[PDB]
Design a protein around this nucleic acid. Structure first.
Ligand SMILES: Nc1ccn([C@@H]2O[C@H](COP(=O)(O)O)[C@@H](O)[C@H]2O)c(=O)n1
Ligand SMILES: Nc1ccn([C@@H]2O[C@H](COP(=O)(O)O)[C@@H](O)[C@H]2O)c(=O)n1
Ligand SMILES: [Mg+2]
Ligand SMILES: [Mg+2]
Ligand SMILES: [Mg+2]
Ligand SMILES: [Mg+2]
Ligand SMILES: [Mg+2]
Ligand SMILES: [Mg+2]
Lengths: 218, 220
RNA sequence: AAGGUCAUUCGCAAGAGUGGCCUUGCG
RNA sequence: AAGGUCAUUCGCAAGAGUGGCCUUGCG
């Protein structure tokens, strides 16, 4: 089964016990699972992104690069790099069916496995990772698709003008449990907006977006 | 320059000295060439070095165990400790302001990105050189339990296990100039209450929480 | 990391550094 | 990442994962 992934990955695993381990959720096999490779994989991949970022950025200033890094190492962006490999079909998982958290953890653990299996060659694993995603990463930046952080953008403009911060207050929580939706107000001076999501923090994000809209004509 | 010293201490000689100079230079000294960029890459690079060492050598590879260790090992305090070996502060070029733990912590992670770039971006060699100096020294600190304790975190899990409550920190005073201050903070759980001091709220809270921890486990 | 803020150094402003404070996001 | 808690899943417990909330630490 792994052979199809190894074609996409373009790498033949010498020890297949690792590749299986990184693909296995603890609900499948308790004693063998991706947990420890996800820990190694993060620091490994987060290093790749930053290393790539410092090389190809016209502006190398830390203030410019760090928020750009914040999105590229995010779990959501890892889910997009996973779509290229179609990871959701390769995972061994039983209960707690696949979601963006599980995928991002496998993707992190996946590269740690390659690092280990190659005999801890960081230089090669880097270029193998680059081979796949280098253009894809440079794509999003050059073509300007980067998840915009609205709660941050908002409060920076409000403090720019009135030297104050927007206030996010809850309205209601609606749904049975995990289907529950949050409704949150966002207020700056005389302006109020709304937003919603599966969490408070998410509901505060959409409300923050609608609020930047609300000051245009202002 | 005088860079011959640090190179021998580092067991590595730079092909580009301008790159080595840039790692030791604060923005104040040179508004043109300084360490800001290498600090960025250096964090991600050196953070990876530590994490790879933990997963490898320690018998307990369980994540919940390893992550707290990482927190101390990648910290600013621990980088200042590792930097004392290299005697970095005497090589640091700075215009205005004292050289503090922040600057040294910045220079340290930045200094390693310099070695990284100068090696032709060889991670295997650089990681080896990092272990060359610090591997046993780091591993000995864990073995001997020289890891710094987190008192705000320990205390909270202590109370939530017993009283199902959280400690509450109150600020009882402030004294001194605005740039150099003094913080006295009280920590409270049930009727048990202690004080603590620090140059920041959190630093004083860690001291207050520590006293509470000692007071508690005694009484409990 | 980023923004506002007080203090301070750059003779003041501009901006920048460092320490304190509040807040936001990423891992 | 860690702890408490609500829900949910492995027939309960134990232990663990997932979604929610409060909190704490590190980069
Ligand atoms: N609160 C923080 C602390 C660090 N960071 C990230 O970690 C990097 C390294 O920060 P340090 O200067 O603390 O080592 C930053 O450049 C930034 O990308 C962050 O994004 N948010
Ligand atoms: N709040 C957080 C989140 C993540 N982390 C670090 O990031 C690692 C991976 O976390 P993720 O699951 O978010 O990718 C953790 O094992 C821990 O070392 C942290 O130290 N503090
Ligand atoms: Mg995890
Ligand atoms: Mg991660
Ligand atoms: Mg900085
Ligand atoms: Mg750092
Ligand atoms: Mg900053
Ligand atoms: Mg966790």
């Amino acid at each position: 089964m792994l052979e199809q992934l190894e074609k996409k990955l373009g790498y033949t695993f010498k020890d297949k016990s690792l590749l299986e381990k990184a693909l296995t959720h603890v609900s499948y096999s308790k004693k063998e699972h991706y947990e420890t490779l996800e820990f190694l994989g993060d620091a490994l991949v987060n290093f790749f992104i930053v290393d790539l970022l410092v090389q190809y950025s016209p502006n190398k200033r830390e203030g410019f690069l760090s928020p750009l890094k914040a999105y590229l190492i995010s779990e959501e962006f890892f889910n997009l790099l996973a779509q290229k490999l179609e990871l959701h079909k390769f995972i061994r998982i039983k209960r707690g069916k696949i979601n963006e958290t599980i995928i991002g953890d496998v993707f992190e653990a996946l590269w740690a496995a390659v690092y280990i299996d190659s005999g801890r060659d960081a230089n090669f694993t880097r270029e193998l990772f680059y081979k796949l995603f280098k253009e894809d990463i440079l794509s999003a930046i050059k073509e300007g698709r980067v998840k915009k952080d609205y709660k941050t953008i908002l409060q920076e403009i409000t403090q720019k003008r009135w030297k104050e911060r927007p206030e996010y207050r809850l309205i209601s929580v609606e749904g049975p449990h995990h289907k529950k939706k949050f409704i949150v107000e966002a207020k700056i001076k005389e302006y109020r907006t709304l937003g919603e999501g599966k969490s408070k923090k998410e509901a505060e994000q959409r409300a923050a977006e609608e609020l930047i809209k609300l000051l245009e004509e202002s």
